[PDB]
């Protein structure tokens, strides 16, 4: 209801972004 849904989709958002970071790094070290 409150930050329940709003704060969740936030971690999830940041999670995804954190994966893309992972990828950029591993290309950039080839």
């Amino acid at each position: 209801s409150e930050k329940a849904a709003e704060e969740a989709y936030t971690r999830t958002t940041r999670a995804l972004h954190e994966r893309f970071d992972r990828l950029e790094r591993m290309l950039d070290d080839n």
Partner: antibody, heavy 122, light 108 residues
């Protein structure tokens, strides 16, 4: 005129709240992105936070997360740093810098404000 | 979690001298590095991004190198207005990190 001006810096008791702003001009803050970095008296540079308004992306340094909140208002083309629970060690000059790209990792911090001082004692 | 070890802490040099400041990233940060210049009471000024890409307007004397995880900022010749302190930065991780600073002073 592409400039960065920062204000709202002042004196606050420990545990108090302050709330800074960084007025943006000569570019669209929303099309791009920003950082608050800070500098304890007599010490080095320290990353505080970042935001890509149009990615609705925000990120933080551990030494906060849960006391500071960074925001944007497209209307005023302005960035905010809301600091609650301020300590003496949060004492420091706080700067803005733009980052020309829309994500923190594709560009460095090109333009910077003059920095406003935040002293915190009891 | 990524430390940037800067070296040296301080350094004396003369006008015309070629100076080198180094930065050891504690783990690959792969090219995502910048160097800043800061004068007392003034904002930092961006010199090199991408571990060695000249920022527009910056004097071509300034230069950046990178060798795996060691980064060098070179100044081919050293003019008056270049006395300052310089910081490397990594921005390869969402926790951006700055080195502790090198003071570049006038050797008299």
């Amino acid at each position: 005129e592409v400039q960065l001006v920062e204000s709202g810096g002042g004196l606050v008791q420990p545990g108090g709240s302050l709330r800074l702003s960084c007025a943006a001009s000569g570019f669209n803050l929303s099309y791009s992105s920003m950082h608050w970095v800070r500098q304890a008296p007599g010490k080095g540079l320290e990353w505080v936070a970042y935001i890509s308004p149009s990615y609705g992306y925000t990120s933080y340094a551990d030494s906060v997360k849960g006391r500071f909140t960074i925001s944007a208002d497209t209307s005023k083309n302005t960035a905010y740093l809301q600091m609650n629970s301020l300590r003496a060690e949060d004492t420091a000059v706080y700067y803005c810098a733009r980052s020309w790209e829309a994500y923190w990792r594709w560009s460095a911090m090109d333009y910077w404000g003059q920095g406003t001082l935040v002293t915190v004692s009891s | 979690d990524i430390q940037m070890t800067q070296s040296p802490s301080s350094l004396s040099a003369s006008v015309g001298d070629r100076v080198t400041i180094t930065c050891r990233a504690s783990q690959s940060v792969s090219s995502a590095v910048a160097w800043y210049q800061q004068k007392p009471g003034k904002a930092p000024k961006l010199l090199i991004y991408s571990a060695s890409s000249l920022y527009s307007g910056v004097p071509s004397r300034f230069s950046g190198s990178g060798s795996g995880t060691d980064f060098t900022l070179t100044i081919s010749s050293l003019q008056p207005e270049d006395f300052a302190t310089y910081y490397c930065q990594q921005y390869s991780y969402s926790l951006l990190t700055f080195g502790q600073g090198t003071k570049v002073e006038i050797k008299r």
